[PDB]
Ligand binder design. Structure first.
Ligand SMILES: CCc1cc(-c2cccnc2)nn1-c1ccc(NC(=O)c2cccnc2)cc1
Ligand SMILES: CCc1cc(-c2cccnc2)nn1-c1ccc(NC(=O)c2cccnc2)cc1
Lengths: 545, 545
């Protein structure tokens, strides 16, 4: 089964075709005059040539300028001194947006096994503002299995040839697919060839007919999750910052650089929902694979994981990447690394942002080891001190480990209070936890194959530099974070709760704040929508500048 | 032996310190009033604290504001309503540039084995315009083995502690190093500790003393070559565009995306001189490792190397990278791929640029095979047709092959005219060619280890799609390149000479042009300075926009 959507008028908001009407009324010009010059000599038409990619857009514009000296001429009329078919067409273009509900449907059908695709008559945009269309094209193109373009296949919508073509590339028979257009003309062929057809008068009904003809709920359906990241379609980057330390990241998007530092014990994958989203927002995302995790080198020494070297290494990463700075957004430990980054390398930090992790100054008087036994929640933080031990029960059964950790506040199957005495973090938990409702079985077998590499020693050593991380931290007792910084708290996070971050103003005067109720500790995978909403809003005004 | 240069006043142009003088004269304020408030309570001084990184710049500004209510107060004076120590300091900062001749010296000494480094009193720039300094810091930082910063080591210039420190990290004794400062105070310590010292009054003499004390020619020395790329300090990127086709590129710089498509039979390394340079120019360079070369997949099928699939693959590369478009700059074949890119995917091409390779329309009447036997120079183009053959003598001895090809116009050891009949391209050449004067023995053993991977079949298949590349090329006989495009020709190129490109205007109306006389076929490594000069000038006004 399949589904083909025309771009204009089905996935594109104000279907360009319409403008020659709109425009016409505005200048009060002879009804239909325009959408008449747009279609001269049927096939010999300038428009059709453009359709077939024989001429560039910039070429066709003038041939359409002319008709508008012949189309208005025969109907005994006249036109304004500077009649911009160019200007009128830019606006129309820049004006079309995505038909969100429609895209939502094509996404669903794919989701429930449908080879979706776009069949569309299109020109070869060589305009000076081509990038805008090319930009939207990307957003859409991305969610479809195929994207057939007239100017690319030298065939145009009506010709039954393109259909046989589309039907070919679609490895399917007419009777297995639907076809939605806003043009009767192009539709007959589908129907006169087999495939179910739907005239897209109004979206609301189109989908009404669609969900109908498919027995799949497409309309007024639950607000979906942002786009996740397929680890195979990602651009994987590498940088060797030191002799035995290579760093892996994932790159997507262009524009201001946004470095994402995940937490413990995750990967660059933890941001699966904010990577496509932020990239789309107008940023260049670099989803860090922190030191010790997955594809990044994972040396044994406990010391190689203190914030000081972790931070000198992040700069080194910027350096070898040719970046003056970047906006570091962090989580869990990633959040701590970030606070220090803004505390020791302001120049290099355009904007600071942490999720859950609070900027807490260091207590020169009480050593962290002490000052941490001074908190119930932080009991597992003890059980992590003896190299070898924690590695053990964690590296014991990767699947079990992640299905146990990556659990919502309520879903829990652990209780980090009294663990050492408990003799393990999984002591009283099922050796086969039920799947969390935040993650699919696949998303888990992914963190499984990742940790199969360097294990849990590298990750467990971040917890093993208390004394060091504290000492270096005192050097910055006089400092003050005056760069754009955001502190985002989660209601149901139990180990890193909102309260801890309440005094962050005394150190960060202009600290903005975000909060997310009914939100666990794995912020990214639990409340992606909010997270993206909150970080994009902040990025537009506090970072980008 | 070693060399340490202070940043300000030695590597930085208008040594900031000076401004408190400049500024003072302007507002006609009591001589020395400023450079007096800049230094209150010796060590307890706000300035010193900043030096030691105890306070951020944004913090110190106000403590310096004040002094200027006490420094002018005791000398019974007054100051203007809005006396911006802030504004005065931004300008001074943004104003300092690199002391090119000085950097040139530190570069030489390293070049002739010298562990060079920067010892400098510096603050922690958290200003709102910090990025500018951080930006220059990068340009410099990059050319020095070490970069000691006061605010990072909690030690400041005068304290003999920092010296013992610098001398420590420098794994050397005072008597083996020189130290150049613009401040006597900080210098005594070096001298009173051993190391040769030089007060940098005027650069001209400093170096005069320097080249002296080193017996190394540092002044009025030959204009050097732009920065080359060390393949180990590069950020290596990967993208799988197809099932069995992964693509490797090198990334450096931020800003507009600039894709570099090398030629035959080179690598991403061919742009070694334009990568650091362009990155520095304000661009994000993606030095492509073309299909079939080095780190990119290299499948056998001759067909997988026609322009059509090579181009659909480049877009796919853009897509998975989150780029709406990019500026494709190409060379040799890389130049051809680019012309087609702008001919079939305008939207995706921000700017077109080719070096040596001319945009030549396709002759529908005469088949390329014919129309190419119709040219002497293109005789080796025949010898490349039979799969297996060319691979052979080329893969025979990698070193010999590249030392023979990568030779200037005059250096030549080949003669591509009459080769098939000659029975090989190396038939009458030394089996141990002398090194070209354009490349070091290392730069060659690099292309050697690269071709050790997929060999010369992938590269030789680009030449094996004449009929196809031509047919697809006819579809675009009506087209017209109206996007920003540059055509750069080389005087001594013999196979792809300037003349071929003379009619490029009829197809590219606004085609700009560059030429480089006394320039071979390996444009990039032969005339890097010009190349960078010509492409950066064009990029600023034709692409960036
Ligand atoms: C066994 C570890 C664990 C289980 C669960 C869990 C399980 C089931 C249900 N819900 C939650 N959450 N966590 C966890 C991980 C990292 C941190 N972060 C830090 O310890 C930390 C420390 C210092 C700075 N930043 C972060 C805090 C808590
Ligand atoms: C054996 C090959 C060779 C030797 C020398 C050489 C040797 C010694 C001294 N000087 C020069 N130059 N070339 C060479 C390589 C690629 C091309 N490009 C193309 O053939 C081409 C074809 C079609 C489109 N674009 C480029 C043209 C010429």
């Amino acid at each position: 089964r399949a589904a083909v959507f025309d771009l204009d008028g089905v996935l594109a908001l104000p279907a360009v075709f319409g403008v020659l009407g709109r425009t016409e009324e505005a200048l009060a010009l002879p009804r239909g005059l325009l959408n008449d010059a747009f279609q001269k000599g049927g096939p010999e038409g300038a428009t059709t040539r453009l359709m077939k990619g024989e001429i560039t857009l910039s070429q066709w514009i003038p041939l359409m300028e002319e008709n508008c000296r012949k189309c208005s001429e025969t109907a005994k009329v006249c036109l304004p001194k500077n009649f911009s078919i160019k200007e009128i067409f830019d606006k129309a273009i820049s004006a079309r947006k995505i038909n969100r509900p429609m895209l939502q449907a094509a996404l669903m059908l794919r989701k429930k096994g449908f080879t979706t695709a776009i069949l569309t008559n299109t020109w070869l945009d060589d305009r000076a503002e081509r990038d805008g269309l090319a930009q939207l094209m990307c957003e859409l193109k991305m969610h479809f299995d195929f994207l057939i373009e007239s100017c690319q296949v030298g065939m145009v919508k009506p010709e039954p040839q393109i259909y046989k073509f589309l039907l070919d590339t679609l490895k399917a028979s007419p009777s297995e697919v639907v076809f939605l257009d806003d043009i009767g003309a192009n539709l007959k062929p589908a129907r006169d060839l087999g495939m179910v057809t739907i005239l897209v008068q109004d979206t609301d009904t189109a989908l009404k007919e669609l969900e109908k003809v498919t027995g799949i709920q497409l309309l007024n359906t639950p607000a979906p999750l942002p786009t996740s990241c397929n680890p195979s379609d990602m651009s994987h980057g590498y940088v060797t910052v030191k002799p035995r330390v290579r760093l892996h990241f994932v790159e997507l998007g262009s524009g201001p650089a946004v470095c994402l530092c995940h937490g413990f014990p995750e990967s660059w994958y933890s941001w699966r929902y904010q990577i496509p989203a932020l990239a789309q927002a107008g940023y260049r995302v670099l989803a860090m694979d922190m030191k010790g995790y997955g594809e990044s080198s994972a040396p044994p020494e406990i010391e190689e994981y203190c914030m000081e070297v972790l931070c000198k290494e992040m700069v080194t990463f910027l350096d070898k990447l040719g970046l003056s700075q970047a906006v570091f957004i962090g989580h869990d430990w990633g959040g701590m690394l970030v606070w220090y980054m803004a505390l020791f390398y302001p120049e290099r930090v355009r904007a600071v942002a942490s999720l859950n992790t609070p900027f807490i100054p260091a207590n020169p008087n009480m050593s962290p080891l002490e000052s941490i036994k001074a908190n119930p929640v932080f009991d597992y933080q003890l059980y992590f001190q003896e190299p070898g031990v924690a590695e053990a029960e964690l590296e014991q059964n990767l699947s079990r480990t992640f299905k146990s950790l990556f659990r919502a506040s309520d879903e829990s199957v652990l209780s980090m209070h009294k663990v050492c005495e408990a003799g393990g973090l999984f002591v009283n938990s099922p050796e086969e936890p039920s799947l969390s409702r935040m993650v699919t079985e696949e998303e888990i077998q992914f963190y499984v194959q990742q940790f199969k590499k360097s294990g849990f020693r590298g990750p467990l050593n971040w917890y093993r530099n208390m004394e060091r991380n504290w000492k270096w931290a005192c050097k910055s007792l006089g400092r003050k974070i005056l760069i754009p910084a955001l502190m985002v708290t989660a209601e149901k996070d139990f180990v890193l709760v909102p309260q801890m971050s309440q005094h962050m103003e005394d150190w960060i005067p202009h600290l903005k704040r975000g909060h997310i109720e009914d939100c666990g500790h794995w912020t990214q995978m639990d409340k992606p929508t909010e997270v993206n909403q909150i970080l994009i809003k902040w990025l537009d005004s506090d970072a980008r500048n």
